[PDB]
C-alpha cells in the first residue's frame, strides 16, 4: 500500500495551502495557534501500526516540497504540526525522535549559507521545544532535560560535528557568510546542553594550532613561544635562551615607540592648560585629568557632524555589500608580507597594533609562571597529554618576571591606567577559570533555581487606638478626678 | 605502538547510520525464519523500513551535490578581481584626503593659540569704554545740580 | 567516486527488495522456496559488501595575480581608518577658551558651554585651500586692531575727563555743605 501514502501527501498539500500565515508571521516571533480544525489532530484523515506510518508520510512530504518561500514555509508548518499533536499519539512520550529527525533532514537541503541564515531565526525562537527530550510537559526555564550520550543526540551530535568539521577545513574558500554561519550553529549547540556536560567546557586543554631583521625576530618568537607554551616550559636551558636572544631587542624597539606616542599628548595638554591658567584670573587647571574629549567646534557644528555620518554610511555599504565577501578581518596582523608588518608596527599614530602583541605576551607568560610555580597544574596537564598519547626553574621564572612585571606594568601603570587596569583584571580572571577547569566545573553545579509563587505583601494602614485613663497613668489622673 | 594506531584506525571509521541497520534486521529475520497470519504484519514493516532507507540515500545524493556547487561559485568569484579594485581604490583616495584636510585644521587652531598668547579682552575693552562714557554725563549733571542749589 | 558509489548502492537495494517481497508472498500462501532462499542470501551479501566501499570512498575525499593586489589595498584601508578614528578624538588639538562674558547679571560661568566667537565658527568649518588660512591671517590682525583702539581710548580720552570732572564735584558738595550746615545747624539752637 504505497497508494495510501501518495494520496495522503496530496491531502496534506491540499489542506496546508489554506492556512493564512506568511513566512515572516510564522518564523520569527510566533508559533501558529490551534486553528487546525482539531479533527485533523486526531489522525483520522480523509484517505483512511499507525505512528511510523504518519512519520514516513510527513518526511516524504517535506522532502518533496523542498524540491523559496513555499518550501520553507510549508516545512515549518510541518514541524509546528508535530509539536501541536503530542497527545493524540500512541506512546506520546515518543514524539521527540520524529521531531529531531524531521529537523535534521531540513538542515540538509538548505543549498547555501544564505538560505541557512535566511531560515535560522525559526530555530532560534523555538529552543524550548528542543529540550523536553521525552517530557510532554514544558520544562522550567534554565533547565535542560537532555543528555549527550543517549537516544536523541546519540548520532545527531556526531553528524552536526561533522558539518562543522567539514566547514572548517576549507580555510581559504570561506566567505564571511560561512564564518558567520559556523558561529550560529556552534552557539546553538552550546545551549541545549548544561554548562558542565563533559562536552561544553573544553574538557582537555587543547591549544588551538631594515625591516627583515625585525620581521625575522617577530616571526621567530611567534612560532617558538606563543603558539606552543608547553614546548617552552619543559625545554632545555638552551632553547629557553634561544628565544631570549631574539625577544629583548624587539620588545625594546616597541617600548621605544610607545613613549613617543604618549609623549606627544602630554605636551598638547600641558600647553593648553598653561594658557588657560595664564589668561583667566582665578582658574586652576587641575592636572592629571587627561580624560580625552573632542573639542567644542566639532561638537557643536552640525555640518561637520553630518559629513562623518554620510561617510560611514558609504564605507558601510561598500564593505557590507556583495562582491566584497572575502574581506580580511579588522585588526589582523599579516605575518608573511614582512614589509607591511614593519609598517603596521612602527607607526606612531595608531596604537592598536602594538597592543595585540603585548596582550599575547601577557597571556602566555601567565600560564608559564602558573605551571612552574604550582605542582597541581602541571600534574593535570601531564595527565592530559599522557591520556592522549601513551636552575631551569630559575631561568624560566626570570624571563617570566622580566616582561610581565618589570618592563610592561611599570610602564603602563605610569603612562595610562585605563589600559593598565584591564590587563590585570584579565590576567586575574584567567586563573579563576583555570582552577575551575582543573576541577570538573563543580561550582557551576550548585546553581539553584527557586521555583515558588509570591503574592503581594501586607501593608498595615491602621494606627493604634487609645484607652480611657486619659491623663496617662492612673495615679496622676486620680488628682483630676477630685472635685 | 602497533596497538595505538591499531585502535586509532578503529575509532576513525565509526558509524551509526541507524535506518540502514534497521533494514538489515528485517532482512535477516525472514531468512532465519525461512530455514525451517502475523506474517502480514511483517509485510507492513517490510514496506515502511524500505521507504525510509531509500529516502535517506536521496538526501545524501542531494547534499553532496549542493556543497560542490558552492565551492565552484566562490572559486570563480575569486578569479575576476580586476573589476573590484577601482572602486575600493576610490574610497581609499577619499579617506586619504579627509585626513589631510583635518590635519590642516589642527594646524590653523595651533597658530591661533600661538598668537592669542602674544597678548586684553576684545569685548571687555568694549563694555569698559561704554561704562566710562556713560557716567561722566551723570557726574556733569549732578555737579551742575550742586552749582545750581548753592 | 562517492556519488557514483551511492548510486550503485541504491541499485543493489532495489535488487534485493523484489526478492524479499517475492518470498513473503509464498509465506502468505502457506498460512520451490530454497531457490529464493539462496537468492535473498546472495543479494544481501552483495548489498552489505556494497556499503563498505562507499564508506571508505567517502572518508578519502575529505582531505591569478590581481588577487594578491586585491588584499593589499584592502588592508591599507583597514590601516588608515584606525589612524583616522584616533585622529578625531585622542590626538585632538583644542582651543584656548578664555572667558569674556558680558551681562553682569550672572555669577557662575560653568566653563563648559564656551562656544567661541560665532564669526570664527564659519571660518573653521569652511575647511570641511590657502584661502581659509589667509582669512585667518586677516582675522587675527582685525582683532589686534579693534582691541588696540579702545585700549588706548580709555587711557588717553576718558581718564582725562573723569579725573578733572570728579575733582570739581567735591568742590560743591563740600563747601555747599558748609553754607548749608553752618547757618541752619546753629540757627535752631
Author numbering:
A (entry chain A): 4 to 51, 60 to 78, 89 to 230, 251 to 431, 443 to 535
B (entry chain D): 5 to 40, 59 to 141, 197 to 227
C (entry chain B): 8 to 38, 53 to 84, 97 to 161, 167 to 227
Quote the study on this structure.
The evolutionarily conserved TRanscript-EXport (TREX) complex plays central roles during mRNP (messenger ribonucleoprotein) maturation and export from the nucleus to the cytoplasm. In yeast, TREX is composed of the THO sub-complex (Tho2, Hpr1, Tex1, Mft1, and Thp2), the DEAD box ATPase Sub2, and Yra1. The THO complex is an integrated structural and functional unit that regulates the activity of Sub2. Tho2, the largest subunit spanning the entire length of the elongated THO, plays a critical role in THO assembly.
Here we present a 3.7 Å cryo-EM structure of the yeast THO•Sub2 complex to reveal the molecular details of the THO complex assembly and the THO–Sub2 interactions. For cryo-EM sample preparation, the THO*•Sub2 complex was subjected to cross-linking with glutaraldehyde to obtain a more homogeneous sample. For obtaining the best quality map for model building, the THO*•Sub2 protomer was extracted from the two rigid copies (1A and 2A) within the tetramer and refined to an overall resolution at 3.7 Å. The largest THO subunit, Tho2, contains a ‘head’, a ‘neck’, and an α-solenoid ‘trunk’. The ‘neck’ is embraced by a bi-lobed Hpr1 (lobe A and lobe B). Tho2 ‘trunk’ folds into an alpha solenoid structure, which binds the Tex1 β-propeller at its center and stabilizes a semi-open Sub2 ATPase at its C-terminal end. An extended region at Hpr1 C-terminal region forms a ‘belt’ lining the Tho2 ‘trunk’. Tho2 ‘head’ domain binds to a four helix bundle, formed by two pairs of anti-parallel helices contributed by Mft1 and Thp2, respectively. Overall, THO stabilizes a semi-open conformation of Sub2 by interacting with both RecA domains (Sub2-N and Sub2-C). Sub2-C makes contacts with two pairs of Tho2 helices (residues 625–695).
